[PDB]
Amino acid sequence: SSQIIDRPKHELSRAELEELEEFEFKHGPMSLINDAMVTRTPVIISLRNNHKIIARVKAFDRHCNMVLENVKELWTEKKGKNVINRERFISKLFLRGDSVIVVLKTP
Amino acid sequence: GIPVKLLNEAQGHIVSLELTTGATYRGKLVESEDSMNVQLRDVIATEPQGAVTHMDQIFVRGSQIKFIVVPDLLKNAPLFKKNSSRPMPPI
Amino acid sequence: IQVAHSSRLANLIDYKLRVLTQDGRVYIGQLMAFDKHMNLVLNECIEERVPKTQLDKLRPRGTTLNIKVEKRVLGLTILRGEQILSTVVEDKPLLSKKERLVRDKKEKKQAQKQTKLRKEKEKK
Amino acid sequence: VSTPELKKYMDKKILLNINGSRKVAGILRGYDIFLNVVLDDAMEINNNHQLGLQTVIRGNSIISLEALDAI
Amino acid sequence: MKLVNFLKKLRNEQVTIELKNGTTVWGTLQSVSPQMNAILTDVKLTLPQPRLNKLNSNGIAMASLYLTGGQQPTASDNIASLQYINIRGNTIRQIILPDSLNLDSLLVDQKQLNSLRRS
Amino acid sequence: MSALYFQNLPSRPANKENYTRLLLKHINPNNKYAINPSLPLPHNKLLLDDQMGLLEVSISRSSKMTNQAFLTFVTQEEADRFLEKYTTTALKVQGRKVRMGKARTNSLLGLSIEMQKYNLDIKKVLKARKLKR
RNA sequence: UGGUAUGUUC
RNA sequence: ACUUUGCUCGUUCCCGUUAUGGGAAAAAUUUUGGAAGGUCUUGGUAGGAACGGGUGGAUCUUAUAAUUUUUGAUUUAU
RNA sequence: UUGGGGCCCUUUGUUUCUUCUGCCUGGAGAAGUUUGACACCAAAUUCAAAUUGGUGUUAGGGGAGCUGGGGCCUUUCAAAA
RNA sequence: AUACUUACCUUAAGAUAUCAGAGGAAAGUCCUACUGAUCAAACAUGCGCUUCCAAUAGUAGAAGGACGUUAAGCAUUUAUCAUUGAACUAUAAUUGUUCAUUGAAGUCAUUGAUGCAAACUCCUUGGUCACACACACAUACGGCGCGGAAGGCGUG
């Protein structure tokens, strides 16, 4: 429990590694995504290229890569005064985990 | 792996490497590492906007390297051979 | 040129590649070797780049665009895998697949003979 | 993993370019396996203003480290 | 759970990989490496213009498309149709999947199910 | 409507679409079709392939008649004007000069143009069935 | 129970 | 579905009769599998099998998403 | 066996499998073919030879047997109708 | 070559196709020259499969180069910063202009760089194969000579 969290991972046994992954997904920061996976509530995800997606999480992963359904991407584009809101609907999408900045669970 | 070992073959021969900032360096390769850190000696250094200077030695961190150009004979080095047989290693 | 559908980067030894890097530069050369980090070794690779002055002819609108491309020649370079972005195949190898097979069987014969000799020489 | 080969640069004046623009010159006192380096009496070459009595540089930000002395 | 083992299951399906340049690669997908090195075959690299007049696009990725060797010389937009592209894994931002495939068959990790039955 | 007949063409292009486009480049360089590859060619069954009169080419792979091909034009006059373009200087495709002359029999598409200027098709198909005998 | 390296003797 | 019963039709043979019934089975036909032989072609012709280990190299998983390559500071931005 | 015609010889170290003999009024002769032979490189003993350490080469075509595979035909056997 | 002397080392683990079914040492493990289905590799072997394979009836041509010449081509555009003195225009602390002095750096180039375009010369590469010098074709074109190169698909 706590002792496997504190110990360095090169010492831990294989079953302890699998146990720590389940523990950090259940009682952790990524537990947020897990709740929205199970309660089937949409999340708002803010990407590194200044695009915002609204979607439901079908699966997620250690690197925060996630399979999403009913994805809606929102972005805005500006030159000088001019600004345009563009929006796009995608049915099913894989999202590599390194782009995400913040993930918000919708009430 | 083979490319890092090819860089170890080129020790003592004039290599030319371009860093990720844009600078070019051409000099003897004194020492190289498994991490690709290289130390060039008697090096002619071209800055990104083009100025050339002379440096006595330089140590570049190998993370910053784009490419390295080694001498042209090293295509005949034996680490490129596909079909090769070993002498049954000892205890 | 057609490339086999199940041809990974280990099959494409001695083909002529077209490696693309992050700064918009293309490296063209015979592929010699690769690694876990995907850092190649290219035999006669020639760097090309599009100058900033030629670049606005690429922007979407004559019939065919003509881009003078600044190329430098370098030889037997090793690239670094961090910079590589995607690779495309330009030309097939010099030797045919049958003729490549013949060479490989020959080289296996000669190598086995040489280590047999080195063994029997260290015995005496 | 493997410590960098800077045993010959110890206690000698050295100029290294932090990031891509800054250029810091100091006496090299120690190094790490990440190529962190700590050098005394640093100065930032542009007029050039001194940094402090003892500085450490994260080797993530070092590109090249040429030596302005004998070696 | 690693979703790369999910992504390896696809193996013969028309995807669209949207990379970090902005360039999008549409094509039939062959293998995926354990570092997400996609190898696609019948690909159609393209670079979407931003629909607002004054905004340019990525300029480096324009150079990258022309230098692939596949840009049609008469073509108006930046498209390059080329057999066999190979893509290093850190470049991929997102992968637009097909509409048809069932997620609830594919997302079952056989190894997780294996250990969970065993223990 | 009069089809020209060409001997001494190269017989190694193979694919008809590739053969027509390469020939048509050697006819009129910087043509519309020849300088844009991966355009569809018009199929004009009973859209000029090329301006200045060229309507179709027609080759076959039949081992009797390899190098020969037949270009059919819009009208009777352009057929004679095309010879005028040579002006007694032989056209050359690849490294071989192409002798050319008006055909002993007009083209089928040329007959379709003149007849519009299907019973004919009945006659031709019965001819084909008689030649199958 | 080893390897590579070094230099001396014959 | 099994068992008994007469009636109607039926690939082939026989009989009662050529209305039709009874009996027999593919023994005539085809497709599928195998053996042998013929013909034509295409490839090989000095190694091969079995056993073995403190044997080399590939691929895969985990350390490994924490500064030196792949879990983002190169869409030039406010 | 001899003669004639055509084409080829840049085969450039004049057939390039190796050695030795040899050639343009010619295309030839002898010996050899993988635990072997041949070519070449480097040294130092104070020329050469000697040895030790290396890199290569040992081929192309046709035939007989022996054998792997396909297509088509015949016979025989079994299950389907 | 031997031998002797030192000096430097003497290690990340684990694995070898998957799923299902029968058997052996209620849960799972292991195994089966066991059995199905999928996958992958090699080797044979085929498809009326798809693309490509250069004049000699001629002095050519195709593909790719030149880090080749014309060439100082033709058209644009570039060549420091601070301090002090002097004249100078001026709405002006003297902003503008010219000459000299001290200090600081300073890739070479200006016959350069950049934009455009054309001619010429030359290198590498290829079945420079066989039969032909032929009146075809709407279902548009016997893809009904032998090889070779590269892929696609199928079987064993």
Full DSSP string of C51-86: -TTTGGGSS----S-----EEEE--SEEE-TTTEEE
CB contact under 8 A, C1 and E39: no
Angle, helix A14-26 to helix A31-38, in steps of 10 degrees: 70
> Is residue F25's beta carbon less than 7 angstroms from any atom in nucleic acid strand J?
no
CATH number reported for the structural domain that contains residue D40 in this entry: 2.30.30.100
Interface of C with F in 49-78 (CB under 8 A): 63-64
C114 CA to I31 C1' in angstroms comes to 28
The answer to whether some atom of strand J lies closer than 7 Å to the beta carbon of F15 is: yes
Among candidate residues A55, A51, A92, the one with its CA nearest the CA of residue A74: A51
The angstrom resolution of this structure is 3.2
* Under 8 Å between Cβ of F2 and F102: yes
CA nearest E63 in C: which residue? Answer: C24
Chain C nearest-CA residue for F31:
C63
Contact flag for C and A (3+ C-beta pairs < 8 Å) = no
Half-sphere exposure of B21 (CA within 13 A, CB side): 22
- Spatial CB neighbours of D51, under 8 Å, sequence gap ≥ 6: D24, D26, D42, D43, D44
CA atoms within 13 A on the CB side of C114: 10
CB E29 within 8 A of CB E13: yes
Establish whether the CB of B90 is closer than 7 Å to any nucleic acid atom in strand G: yes
Residues D41, B40 contacting (CB under 8 angstroms): no
* H/E stretch holding C89: strand C84-91
| Distance, CA of E118 to C1' of J26, in Å | 14
CA distances from A93 to A58, A90, B5, E103, F133 (A): 10, 7, 41, 11, 63
C22 vs F: CB within 8 A = no
CB-CB: which of B1, B69, B84 is closest to C77?
B69
C109, with CB counted inside 10 A (0-12, 13-18, 19+), is exposed
**Pairwise CA distance, residues F75 & F55, whole Å:** 9
Please give the Cα distance from A50 to A53 (Å, whole number): 10
Q: What are residue C12's phi and psi, to 5 degrees?
A: -90, 50
C60: Cβ contacts below 8 Å, ≥ 6 apart = E49, E76, E77, E78
Residue of C nearest to B73 (CA): C76
Q: Report CA-CA distances (Å) from C122 to B87, C61, C118, E76.
A: 11, 74, 6, 70
Tell me which H or E stretch contains A14: helix A14-26
Is B79 in contact with B5 (CB distance < 8 Å)? yes
Domain count, chain A: 1
Q: Give the best residue of E93, E102, E111, E119 to mutate against chain A (max A CB count within 10 A).
A: E93
Q: What residues contact C58, with CB distance under 8 A and at least 6 apart?
A: C50, C65, C67, E62, E63, E66, E78
CA dihedral over E85, E88, E91, E93, signed as positive or negative: positive
Contact E31, E13 (CB under 8 A): no
CA-nearest of F85, F90, F23, F89 to F56 is: F23
Tokens at E100, concatenated = 């048809």
CB contact burial B16-26 (16+ within 10 A = b; e otherwise): bbbbbeebbbb
D49: CB partners within 8 A, 6+ apart: D43
Partners of E15 in the beta sheet? E27
H/E stretch holding F125 reads: helix F119-132
Phi-psi region of F94 (alpha: psi -120 to 50; beta: other; left: phi over 0): left
User: D61 is in which domain, residue-wise?
Assistant: 1-71
Let me know: does B37 contact D4? Beta carbons within 8 Å: yes
The structural domains of chain E, with segments of one domain joined by +, span 1-119
State the chains in contact with E (3 or more Cβ–Cβ pairs under 8 Å).
Answer: A, C
Question: Dihedral of CA C10/C13/C17/C22: which sign?
Answer: positive
Query: Which residues are within 8 A (CB) of E97 and not within 5 positions of it... i.e. 6 or more apart?
Result: A91, A92, A93, A94, E10, E15
Contacting residues of F for C63, CB less than 8 Å apart? 35-36
How many structural domains does chain D have? Answer: 1
Is the domain spanning B1-91 CATH 2.30.30.100? The answer is: yes
Q: Which experiment gave this structure?
A: cryo-EM
Q: How far apart are CA B54 and CA E95, in angstroms?
A: 48
The letter for the amino acid at C3 is V
Secondary-structure breakdown of chain B: helix, strand, coil percentages, each rounded to the nearest 5: 20, 40, 35
How far apart CA C46 and CA C28 sit, in angstroms, is 5
Q: Name the residue with tokens 């409507």.
A: F1
Closest to A94 measured CA to CA, from F130, F16, E6, C62: E6
- Which neighbouring-strand residues pair with C41? C33, C78
CATH number for the domain that contains residue A59: 2.30.30.100
- Chain B contact set for C32 (CB, 8 A): 2, 75, 80
User: What is chain C's alpha carbon radius of gyration, rounded to the nearest angstrom?
Assistant: 20
CA pair distance D43, E29, nearest whole angstrom: 54
